[PDB]
Design a protein around this ligand. Structure first.
Ligand SMILES: CC(C)(COP(=O)(O)OP(=O)(O)OC[C@H]1O[C@@H](n2cnc3c(N)ncnc32)[C@H](O)[C@@H]1OP(=O)(O)O)[C@@H](O)C(=O)NCCC(=O)NCCS
Ligand SMILES: [Cl-]
Length: 186
């Protein structure tokens, strides 16, 4: 058929039939649910990268004390449908919120929930006197790459760069390090 930590704008989620919670640490059950979303969304991308995928390794990462979680659940099912995780840190001398994950279940993508999570992360960062937002992204993840570009992320000086030599050597990095300034006004 090809030719026919007070969060902002919570009312937006209410209008979608979802709600948000902030976690300092994930409880055992929810840890497993978030892991399931990351694995479902990302396993293939991790596999094809130099980083690889290890279930046990991703799990331990998500348990790290430094990571804070913003989680969105469906009002009817009370199931997790998305989250954003981050740490407050420093990157090359710059104070930042470093995003580890932004993950949405398939059925809730493309409805401005990604924007909602990113915007709130950015606001939180600014209010914590964190001047930048940083993240890593796979070069092969084209949708995410363009999503970030739209929200003014650009490669940090520390990001790997494309390189081509007359010798025939071609270097395509499998990830970028992106950043942008945090902002309180959206
Ligand atoms: C990446 C992700 C979180 C973005 O969420 P999303 O639901 O798809 O995007 P949203 O609907 O919330 O985006 C809203 C804004 O982003 C823009 N946008 C979204 N995707 C875009 C794309 N591929 N190219 C250009 N702009 C894009 C929209 O224009 C919109 O901006 P606007 O209101 O100013 O017009 C989502 O696609 C996802 O969960 N992907 C799977 C997991 C993943 O790859 N995470 C990144 C690695 S951790
Ligand atoms: Cl990615």
């Amino acid at each position: 058929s090809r030719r026919m930590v007070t969060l902002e704008d919570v009312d937006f989620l209410k209008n979608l039939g979802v709600w948000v919670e902030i976690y300092h640490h994930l409880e055992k059950g929810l840890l497993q649910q978030c892991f399931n979303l990351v694995k479902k969304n990302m396993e293939a991308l991790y596999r094809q990268s130099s980083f690889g995928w290890d279930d046990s390794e991703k799990l331990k990462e998500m348990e790290m004390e430094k990571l804070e979680y913003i989680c969105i659940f469906e009002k009817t099912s009370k199931k997790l449908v998305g989250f954003l995780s981050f740490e407050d840190t420093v990157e090359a001398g710059l104070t930042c919120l470093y995003i580890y994950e932004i993950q949405l279940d398939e059925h809730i993508r493309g409805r401005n929930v990604g924007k909602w999570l990113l915007k709130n992360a950015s606001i939180l960062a600014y209010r914590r006197n964190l001047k930048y937002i940083f993240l890593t992204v796979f070069s092969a993840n084209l949708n995410a790459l363009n999503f970030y570009h739209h929200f003014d992320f650009v490669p940090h000086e520390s990001s790997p760069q494309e390189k081509k030599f007359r010798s025939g050597k071609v270097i395509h990095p499998d990830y970028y390090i992106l950043y942008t300034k945090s902002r309180k006004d959206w």
